[PDB]
Design a protein around this nucleic acid. Sequence first.
RNA 1: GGAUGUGUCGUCGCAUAGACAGCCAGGAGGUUGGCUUAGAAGCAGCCACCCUUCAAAGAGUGCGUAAUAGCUCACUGGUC
RNA 2: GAUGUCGGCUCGUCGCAUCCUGGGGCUGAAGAAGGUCCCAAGGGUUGGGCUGUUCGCCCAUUAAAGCGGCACGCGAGCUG
Lengths: 175, 71, 171, 37, 136
Amino acid sequence: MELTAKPRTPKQKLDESMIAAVAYNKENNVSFALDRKAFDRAFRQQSTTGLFDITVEGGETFPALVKAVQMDKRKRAPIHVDFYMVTYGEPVEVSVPVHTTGRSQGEVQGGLVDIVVHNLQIVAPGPRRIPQELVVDVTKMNIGDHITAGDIKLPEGCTLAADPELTVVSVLPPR
Amino acid sequence: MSYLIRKAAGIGKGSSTPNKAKVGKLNWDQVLEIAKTKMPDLNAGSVEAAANTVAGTARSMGVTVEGGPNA
Amino acid sequence: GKQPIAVPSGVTVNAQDGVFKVKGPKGELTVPYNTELTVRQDGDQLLVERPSDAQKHRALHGLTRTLVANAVKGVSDGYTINLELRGVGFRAKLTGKALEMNIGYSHPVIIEPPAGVTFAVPEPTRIDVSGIDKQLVGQVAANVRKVRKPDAYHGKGVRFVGEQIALKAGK
Amino acid sequence: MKVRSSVKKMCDNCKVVRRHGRVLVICSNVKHKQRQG
Amino acid sequence: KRTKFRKQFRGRMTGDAKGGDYVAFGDYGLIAMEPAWIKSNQIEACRIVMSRHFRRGGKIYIRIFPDKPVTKKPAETRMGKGKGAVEYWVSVVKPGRVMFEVAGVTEEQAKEAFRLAGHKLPIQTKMVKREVYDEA
RNA sequence: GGAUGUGUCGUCGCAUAGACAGCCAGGAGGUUGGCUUAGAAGCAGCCACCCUUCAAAGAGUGCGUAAUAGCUCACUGGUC
RNA sequence: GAUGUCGGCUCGUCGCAUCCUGGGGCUGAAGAAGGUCCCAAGGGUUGGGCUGUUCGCCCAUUAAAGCGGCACGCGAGCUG
Ligand SMILES: [Mg+2]
Ligand SMILES: [Mg+2]
């Protein structure tokens, strides 16, 4: 990930393949002018759960995570990105994609697998030691079967930011 | 093929829904008398090539699988 | 694409200016084309080069090459269409240079061919159209086909010898 | 001839070939013949 | 469809979509590209169309709702007061807004189900998927 | 609403270890899958989309019959 | 300080979204008779009974007995 300038006059990048962005922690709050194509190609791979080394004009390599993206309505194309400057030992609460594995002895019976929360907020994992996904077994489930927070495996020293009895994956009936 | 399972397990028709309320269950030695009468029509090799094809007809009919591989 | 041209024996392409003239043993057959595209003999065989590669030049390319091959295969051996009459009582005869069909209509149909084109009949239930230019032979045979198109219920009419027809069938 | 103002692909046999500035359809099956005028 | 109780009558004005994500609830969605007034019966058409196509499941999310009264021409008049509440109910839909989203059905099982629904709508639309994380 | 109209930029793939199209040639055994019926056999509708042989063939796409058969595709080699 | 108002009659002309006749395509088009859509405005488009009626219903025929415009065409043209 590479970028150029940073002023408040954005006519030089407007028409061009660029997205105006920012990175902050509690020291340096540097403004950007990164490539739209590159950010799109890469952000789709890494999302919020992943981070990437961003080298500015010349050479100042920095590890950063994606905080929030404010895309244009009408045309779904992104317009502004917010990066969070990663420390070394401790990160923030990260929303993790809740995916599914295997068929359900309820899905084939009459119903279907419904992931209520598509992303899950998790307390103090450790940066560069963040789960890129979240595999959840569904096979044990029938009709009326819910899976809460206190039913999900957390990869080494991770804690749940969400409520203990918050419904994550529920298998629903037909019609 | 349908009548050999219907007589052995005790089935009249089959199953309206092969996912909900099941039909029955059969044993592995019974597969030996089905393949021995249907051997000239089979293109398959020997032993393992005929024991696996017969079991698949019990799937959509509603007759449960017994044992299988490993352990 | 369209590139290789086979030119046997009596070939004489005198492609001067816009008139891409072709003289041979089976009479002199002329054919006009675009000057914007290049065409000449490169020793033994022939080649039709194109300048631009947009689309308007691409379309005329494949067309110009097939038409010269058609005019080449024309003065070489020739063109001949084999037509078949079908249905009870249907028959064709010869009145000098003209073809005469008696195909279900109250009066008999007569067809005088244009220049260079010749009609021939082996058995009275079979028509043969032979000539120089592919187009003229194509048309003349199509006019004979027009005289009676094979119907969807019985296939009665003028067909292409080994022609396959789907049959609707009502009652 | 079924003159439909919205000519769409029905089966793998229809060949959309334009004629004199209008959308026309040539197909093997006689019922499949679609035009716009 | 219609709301339970309220005030009776309203007004009218327009500008770009306010509260309409892309993901949430379902996997695939349908998005308005033009500003409109989506009738109650207009949605009820889309629901029914998509409903039929999926047969069993009902994994269709109707994000829009007709929270708006519209009035009408008793027969001719003008000499007299304000007009009849009971013409129709509408949902003001500005470009970007998600009207419908589908769950569990395949990519094509949704491309087509939404295509049919589009034909019952007074405005241009487009089908959508994932990568929309503002709040969850 | 529709469309191989031309112009320019993007996204997904398949490829000289030889693809897309085109011609030769194969077409699945189980099995006329179970249900559903006066019949429903790849093709009116409910559940699945398991297996064998291999160079390959999906309880299979559209037409045909009243149900069959026919005649093709998804897949497999040669020639290019 | 006035643009006479329904129907009829007389007189026409024009649009085509065509009633007939002409040319076509598809058909659940065998033929004959149709259906439906496309192209087409050259000419044609009957006489009575009831009603001020336009309309409509009926009688008897027809290739057909089209729908509209022209200040709901036309009263310095007639009726009333
Ligand atoms: Mg008055
Ligand atoms: Mg006619």
